[PDB]
Design a protein around this nucleic acid. Sequence first.
RNA 1: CAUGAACGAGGAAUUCCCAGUAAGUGCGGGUCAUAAGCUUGCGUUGAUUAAGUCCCUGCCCUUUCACACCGCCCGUCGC
Lengths: 204, 204, 55, 62, 190
Amino acid sequence: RRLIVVLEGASLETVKVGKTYELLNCDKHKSILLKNGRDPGEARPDITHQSLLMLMDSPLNRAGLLQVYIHTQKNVLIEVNPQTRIPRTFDRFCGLMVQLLHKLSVRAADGPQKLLKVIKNPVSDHFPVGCMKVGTSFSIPVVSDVRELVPSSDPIVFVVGAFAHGKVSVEYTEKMVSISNYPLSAALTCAKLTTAFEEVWGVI
Amino acid sequence: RRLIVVLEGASLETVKVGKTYELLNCDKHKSILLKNGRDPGEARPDITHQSLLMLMDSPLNRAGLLQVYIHTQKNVLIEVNPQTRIPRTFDRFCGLMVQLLHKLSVRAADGPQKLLKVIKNPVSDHFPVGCMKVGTSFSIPVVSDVRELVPSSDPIVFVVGAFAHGKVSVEYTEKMVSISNYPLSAALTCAKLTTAFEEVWGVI
Amino acid sequence: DILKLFNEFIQLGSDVELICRCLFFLLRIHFGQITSNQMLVPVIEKLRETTISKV
Amino acid sequence: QPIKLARVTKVLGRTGSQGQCTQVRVEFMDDTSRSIIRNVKGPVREGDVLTLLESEREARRL
Amino acid sequence: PDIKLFGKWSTDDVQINDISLQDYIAVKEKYAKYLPHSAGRYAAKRFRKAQCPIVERLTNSMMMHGRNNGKKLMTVRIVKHAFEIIHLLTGENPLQVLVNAIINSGPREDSTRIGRAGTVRRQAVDVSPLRRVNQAIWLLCTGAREAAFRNIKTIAECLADELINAAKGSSNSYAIKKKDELERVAKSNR
RNA sequence: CAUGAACGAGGAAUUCCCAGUAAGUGCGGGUCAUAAGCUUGCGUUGAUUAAGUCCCUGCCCUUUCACACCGCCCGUCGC
Ligand SMILES: Nc1ncnc2c1ncn2[C@@H]1O[C@H](CSCC[C@H](N)C(=O)O)[C@@H](O)[C@H]1O
Ligand SMILES: Nc1ncnc2c1ncn2[C@@H]1O[C@H](CSCC[C@H](N)C(=O)O)[C@@H](O)[C@H]1O
Ligand SMILES: [Mg+2]
């Protein structure tokens, strides 16, 4: 058994200024974003950053029952190694991601094992067989107990939007659930979803 | 009944470079940190920044059952209004701390209420009298589940450190707990306390 | 316990003046409490013969 | 344990860490002819009456 | 002749139920006065303020903070109005209520302090009757002052409710809670 | 006449204070120096806490014939 969590609407891209390559941030890049009339505040690479930190540092990941996949708005799919470590600081994390989209992969600094690498569209094909897909949004009127939905020994996919505004909608999810009646961050959503699967799989 | 969270040993202090005042960051201010022989890699407001987002969006804070206290390394105490909207992105968060640490208070933009304020040490004077005070460390051999420590009708104080290395050791705590067999982050720690209190106190 | 030991110090005959000074001070400050306790009856009986004969 | 009342017979001196406390000798109002040594906080003089919630504790004990 | 406080509150029926505090509460026939304003010198010598009538002590203790310094006639009027309110609400002698409140509000054991830079360590000790009376008066006055602040309620009314609750022994009063917490801290580290 | 800003008791720390004292209030003067972008008198109202130790931070000293009490501080380097 294994938990699968998928991140969609990730705002990850690299933009050239001067001669350099930088991760696209609303903070660092007001002026260029105001150019071309593209919407300020839509670029939220930070949301992806902290959300990883809750996911990666979770004991179940250290227990090894956790895999994370990301769908960017740019329709790019990237894998993460269980032994990958995320920079705690924002810009060091941006230090990696700029190297990602160009170099397309990240070997470990202590070995040729691949920490990061872009995988092929679609990710639906990379799913293990006999795995069921659950998408999560606040807008569902009925709240589901998370501990109820767990398969005892089966993989299960959770699809969590890394976007600022909108609603999750992708084709291959079988059902929609809500886990709270409050408008929640994806950051705690990841923390909450990891939290309930701790007990049912017996990891403490 | 309320949940009181104390962030102990926060690394919140301001430095001046050029003509500008800004919060002391390890990566940004690497050069000046090596000046004066100050230990590099101790300027970590992000643990403080990351924990606040975890607490302030929590459903327990949504229902109005949370109050958060910050005690920085330079012996400055900050009270957090539950109505406050924390700056999600790091740089505007840094500007907020500089403004608060200089002007000693922060007024709401659209409301007359003060949101942030520096108050009188020690923090133990501001607790409700007779309340339970608990500290959290991975160093305790016995792992305790959060839910049975939750009081039915009384306020309680939980103390979490805002540092990467060291042990929480402050005077007013009377029993010291471990709640996982793994080293976790503060942001996860602030996450996994607040959700367990929510299910005990009927916050869903 | 001290009263039993003070009986020993007198009967051996050493340092009588200081012990008697110590002995008489304790008896006055604890006069009432000593009188109530019947366990102390044998103790003072040996003190009574020992002290006056030695002095 | 019943509450006890004591009368101050001798004021011995100023003790404590900072000299704030006062060592005194007290005797119980009961006809038990007992007397102990107690620590008092605040101005205390001869003839005062003290309320002891627990009368078994001794101020100078190993 | 008979001396009654404010011309209407008798002192003969007032009685003290605590043996320890009988010598430190001055309300009886020799200390019976018409007004709590005597222009005496009770702070000149140690232990002399035990001879000051307790109503005058309360009046002196209500001249705070700062904005009330030196205004004793106003405090006398406040005390008179509070006594009238107490009599209207309960129907008993307000002097007896004040005596009972002072008896109940006085802590019996406190804690002495041995403190260094790192931590402070703690020990239980006893309290003299004079400090008991002083601390009871201080706690009652502080409770009334904090209750009246930034609230639509006269200071005399808040003082009346504080005395009523303290004489009742209820936990709704500031002084009772403070005394209970101090006694609990003293008890816990015996 | 009109308008109605911050300010809801003021952090890290720091200074001062034991009786007609702390604090509030008024009324005078300008005296061969100072003072009026202020100083200095005089009256009026008038408290809480404390009256004792060397624990911290320091200071000043000492350790050569009534009755009664008491019964010699230690070390180093020189000459
Ligand atoms: N109450 C709730 N229950 C389940 N998921 C929630 C939730 N509140 C927010 N989320 C999730 O948190 C992520 C960021 S919130 C972003 C907006 C999102 N469409 C929404 O419904 O609020 C989204 O992917 C959403 O699925
Ligand atoms: N497994 C765990 N159980 C309870 N508290 C934990 C924990 N892991 C980390 N913490 C708390 O989270 C804070 C930051 S984690 C920093 C490391 C910390 N010195 C440690 O003992 O692991 C620390 O103050 C620590 O008390
Ligand atoms: Mg000294």
